């Protein structure tokens, strides 16, 4: 089955250089193309560049004299690298595999989830995970004081899924971010089950799972 | 460098109405071969982009027969009929023809779908934080719709202004709903200095204000 | 002669507000609708908004939510003040007197320099200026470790103006910017004339004269 | 909202030469009133936005005859006869017919010169820096064309790398150049650890690369 998943290092500082690799599974980097595409928070797609099957790479003007894509088709991995980073190249950077065509794609099938680069000279800080305590019921988690972005949560890890707001951070005045995750549950479970939150920020490899009582 | 010009930017339309998004690019993009590379992506909130068209008008699979794209040379349309709360997203189209590749600017869709009134609830600040010295007071509005919607903060019937801040989900893709969490922080100090902590919405779903308060 | 000149704060942190004022001169606000349009770093021109001559206002659909602007005819002054700051809203700022027409003017002919606004949870630094000491002869000032945006350079009070290159800041690890100016001088001159450079950074107050000596 | 596409993206055009920028409107800028209020702005490296042409053809006071804009409905051009080094700029169009009012996204023009080599000077880290602990060493490259250099940096002939930046200034209005400046940063520990400073630089303009260098 088709996947692909990017791995960075979640904040790189100004002038310094980042480096992505995309993980792939279920098709040959032999036989396929692979695009680059970020998204910038709050802006649309740009196309950064493509890796061909056959190895030659072409890039987006605005970035090619500070841009490499290279592959190694027996480990499945193609790489980005960009020398001189700044904020502007802070964005979620995508993967995606060609479908379709011989020459030119027919289109992009497969994307991975994408990778949250931060271009800033801050330091990595894990969150803070307060609870917000409880026929309906909402109960919730306060994620304050994080950098940078994500942030993922879950409830109950994971068995819990309906009804859950997780809602988009805030940066705050001091620079770090803060965001809250509500879930609603039926009252009556309130004596019966467990709530717990997980909350998992990896750029600072920190998980913390808090339990929400009454 | 192909430019790809998109409108509208935004597309608010009702369930169960056709939607149109217009792709325009500034020279042909037939390529050579006589194939025209002309894509239209859909990224759902919180999702990777997926593609839905191919080739001007060609369906990717399990993509539904109310999705149809057409045009040629440089002028371009997707059309959704009967739009449906999971078709809500961005839309992008995309040209492979020339060196390099473009993107559109992308068509934000918006669900307009009947009012819905937000069900308010208000949390206090947990003991664990104000022992570590400030006082987060949050008001939460669930599942509303449309999304314009008001939230007062009052301490000791004191109207609060400069210290709280919104935020707001993306439309659902089940529903066509919002949620708002606007939150109010405080010192711990000032938070110990009141009794009534009081948040109060007012939205169209909604024949009057609905306060949700508790005293500390 | 007509003028325009924006002023701000310089730095504002994320999540707090933005006041600017456009102080105007040589035409009369009654008389005149004036534009608010931003340029963020190395991006496009953006139409913000309009305070027309009546005082009626219109504004940026993405921004509309979060601005408002006003004026005072008497003291020549339109505001701009934007709530909830974003990173985004890092920009130079310009404010723009209206020509032509009636209700709908012909073009923008009279625009301020623009005011630099930078949306930071850092805190503002002064500059440290180090002179590089040289038929053609080079010499400069290094402008190191500022924040934020923008210092102005010149050399001799303004008087040398030839030859001069002033080169756009660069952002560092540090997250602080640094730039060099040049000057391009005969050699004859290195024993007879002295070389000064006066170096100006509004946010933090400094303002710094450098002699630049062999 | 409507969308103003302006193309190209980046013009480099040889001194001397006719430009051709174009500007298209996703609808008809045609206003009610009958007038179509389209308006092309030049910003200069270093300065504000100025008003070029007005209602499509209206040359702005002070705008050589060179300049020219022409076209109507959703089609317009502005064309300079004789691109001189001074109109370098940012080319914005502007609609003012339809609420809200838009900038196109700018075209950028180069202007293309002959070949002019850089003088190349280095400057040692000044005194003062030194006794404050940091140790920067720049590199100077003083007028040249075009804007394609290569600055490498080899202290006792040891090739450096991750430890320096450059800046380019834009391209001079006069004499349609570059400069640029390299500068590498060290420690004042590391900066006196080593004798032998050197910038070698790659253009188009000089026989062989250049190097310029010191001793501590
Ligand atoms: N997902 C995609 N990545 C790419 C990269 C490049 C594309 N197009 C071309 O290279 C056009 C070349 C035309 C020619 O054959 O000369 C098309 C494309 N689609
Ligand atoms: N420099 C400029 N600022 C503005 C602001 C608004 C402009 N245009 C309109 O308001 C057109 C409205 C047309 C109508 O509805 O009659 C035009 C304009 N030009």
């Known amino acids: 089955d088709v996947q692909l998943l990017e791995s960075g290092p979640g904040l790189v500082a100004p002038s310094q250089s980042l480096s992505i690799t995309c993980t792939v599974s279920?098709?040959?980097?032999?036989?396929?193309?692979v695009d680059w595409v970020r998204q910038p928070p709050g802006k649309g797609l740009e196309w950064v560049g493509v890796?061909?099957?056959?190895?030659?790479?072409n890039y987006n003007s605005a970035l090619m004299s500070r841009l490499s894509i290279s592959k190694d088709n027996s480990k499945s991995q193609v790489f980005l690298k960009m020398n001189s980073l700044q904020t502007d190249d802070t964005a979620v950077y995508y993967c995606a595999k060609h479908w379709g065509g011989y020459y030119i794609p027919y289109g992009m099938d497969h994307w991975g989830q994408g990778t949250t680069v931060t271009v800033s000279s801050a330091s990595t800080k894990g969150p803070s995970v307060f609870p917000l305590a409880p026929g309906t019921a909402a109960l919730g988690c306060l994620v304050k004081d994080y950098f940078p972005e994500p942030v993922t949560v879950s409830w109950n890890s994971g068995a819990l899924t309906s009804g859950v707001h997780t809602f988009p951070a805030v940066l705050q005045s001091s620079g770090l971010y803060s965001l809250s995750s509500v879930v609603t549950v039926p009252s009556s479970s309130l004596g019966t089950q467990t709530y717990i939150c997980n909350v998992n920020h990896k750029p600072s490899n920190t998980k913390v799972d808090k339990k929400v009582e009454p | 460098e192909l430019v790809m010009t998109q409108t509208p930017l935004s597309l608010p339309v009702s369930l169960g109405d056709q939607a149109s998004i217009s792709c325009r690019s500034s020279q042909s993009i037939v390529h050579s071969n006589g194939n025209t590379y002309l894509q239209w992506y859909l990224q759902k909130p919180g999702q990777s982009p997926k593609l839905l068209i191919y080739?001007?008008?060609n369906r990717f699979s399990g993509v539904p027969d109310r999705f149809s794209g057409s045009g040629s040379g440089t002028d371009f349309t997707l059309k959704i009929n009967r739009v449906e709360a999971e078709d809500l997203g961005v839309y992008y189209c995309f040209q492979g023809s020339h060196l390099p590749p473009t993107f559109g600017g992308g068509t934000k869709l918006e669900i307009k779908r009947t009012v819905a009134a937000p069900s308010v609830f208000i949390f206090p600040p947990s003991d664990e934080q104000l022992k570590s010295g400030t006082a987060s007071v949050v008001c939460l509005l669930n599942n509303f719709y449309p999304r314009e919607a008001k939230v007062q903060w009052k301490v000791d019937n004191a109207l609060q202004s400069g210290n709280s801040q919104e935020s707001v989900t993306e439309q659902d893709s089940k529903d066509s709903t919002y949620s708002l969490s606007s939150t109010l922080t405080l010192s711990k100090a000032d938070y110990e200095k009141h009794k009534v902590y009081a948040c109060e919405v007012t939205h169209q779903g909604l024949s009057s204000p609905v306060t949700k308060s508790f005293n500390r | 002669d007509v003028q325009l000149l924006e002023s701000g704060p310089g730095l504002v942190a994320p999540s707090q507000s933005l006041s600017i004022t456009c102080?105007?001169?040589?035409?009369?606000?009654?008389?005149?609708?004036?534009?608010?349009v931003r340029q963020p770093p190395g991006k496009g021109l953006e139409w913000?908004?309009?305070?027309?001559?009546?005082?009626?206002?219109?504004?940026?659909s993405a921004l509309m939510s979060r601005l408002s602007i006003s004026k005072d005819n008497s003291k020549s002054q339109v505001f701009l003040k934007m709530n909830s700051l974003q990173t985004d809203d890092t920009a130079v700022y310009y404010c723009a007197k209206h020509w032509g027409g009636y209700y709908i003017p012909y073009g923008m002919d009279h625009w301020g320099q623009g005011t630099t606004v930078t949306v930071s949870s850092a805190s503002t630094k002064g500059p440290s200026v180090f002179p590089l000491a040289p038929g053609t002869a080079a010499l400069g000032c290094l402008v190191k470790d500022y924040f934020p945006e923008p210092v102005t350079v010149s050399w001799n009070s303004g008087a040398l103006t030839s030859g001069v290159h002033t080169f756009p800041a660069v952002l560092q690890s540090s997250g602080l910017y640094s730039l060099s100016s040049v000057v391009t001088v005969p050699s004859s001159s290195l024993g007879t004339q002295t070389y000064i450079c006066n170096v100006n950074h509004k946010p933090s107050n400094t303002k710094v004269d450098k002699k630049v000596e062999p | 909202e409507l969308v103003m596409t302006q193309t190209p993206l980046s013009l480099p055009v040889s001194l001397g030469d006719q430009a051709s920028i174009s500007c298209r409107s996703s609808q008809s800028i045609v206003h009610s009133n009958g007038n179509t209020y389209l308006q092309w702005y030049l910003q200069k490296p270093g300065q504000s936005p100025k008003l070029?042409?007005?209602?499509?053809?209206?040359?702005?006071s002070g705008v050589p005859d060179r300049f020219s804009g022409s076209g109507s409905g959703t089609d317009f051009t502005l064309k300079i006869n004789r691109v001189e080094a001074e109109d370098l700029g940012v080319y914005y169009c502007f609609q003012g017919s339809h609420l809200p009012p838009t900038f196109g996204g700018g075209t950028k023009l180069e202007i293309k010169r002959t070949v002019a080599a850089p003088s190349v000077f280095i400057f040692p880290p000044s005194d003062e820096q030194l006794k404050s602990g940091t140790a920067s060493v720049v590199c100077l490259l003083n007028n040249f064309y075009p804007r394609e250099a290569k600055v490498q940096w080899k202290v006792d002939n040891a090739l450096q790398s991750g430890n320096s930046q450059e800046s380019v200034t834009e391209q001079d209005s006069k004499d349609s150049t570059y400069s640029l400046s390299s500068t590498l940063t060290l420690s004042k520990a590391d900066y006196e650890k080593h004798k032998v400073y050197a910038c070698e630089v790659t253009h188009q303009g000089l026989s062989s690369p250049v190097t310029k260098s010191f001793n501590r």
């Open positions: 279920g098709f040959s980097l032999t036989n396929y193309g």
């Open positions: 080739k001007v008008s």
């Open positions: 890796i061909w099957s056959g190895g030659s790479t």
